[PDB]
Design a protein around this ligand. Structure first.
Ligand code: HEC
Length: 79
């Protein structure tokens, strides 16, 4: 949910309705659906670049994959 995203440092680089370093969560929800959850979860975990730009999202080797999936399913409901 939102409190979890913020507890895991996500909202330093992402906001619901505007762009910061990474895409807005509303743009992420517009690009993907619940079909894509497994793919997004790997991206947050392993990090990486190129889908939205050249600046990489760092890996998250110490955030539980269960928590990441929670944040990701919530991101996707922001329409
Ligand atoms: C900067 C220090 C970041 C923090 C911390 C987090 N994210 Fe991020 N994210 C960042 C960038 C620069 C990008 C674009 C990467 C690219 O391919 O261009 C992203 C991307 C995402 C995405 C979209 C993934 C994709 O479309 O391939 C999601 C769903 C996302 N980020 C979620 C997310 C979560 C849940 C974070 C906290 C656990 C998190 N990000 C941190 C920059 C940064």
């Amino acid at each position: 949910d939102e409190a979890l995203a913020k507890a895991k440092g996500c909202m330093a680089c992402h906001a619901i309705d505007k762009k910061l370093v990474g895409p807005s969560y509303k743009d992420v929800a517009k690009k993907y659906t619940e079909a894509d959850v497994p793919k997004l979860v790997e991206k947050v975990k392993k990090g990486g670049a190129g889908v939205w730009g050249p600046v990489p999202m760092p890996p998250h080797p110490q955030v539980a994959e269960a928590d990441i999936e929670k944040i990701v399913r919530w991101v996707l409901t922001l329409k």
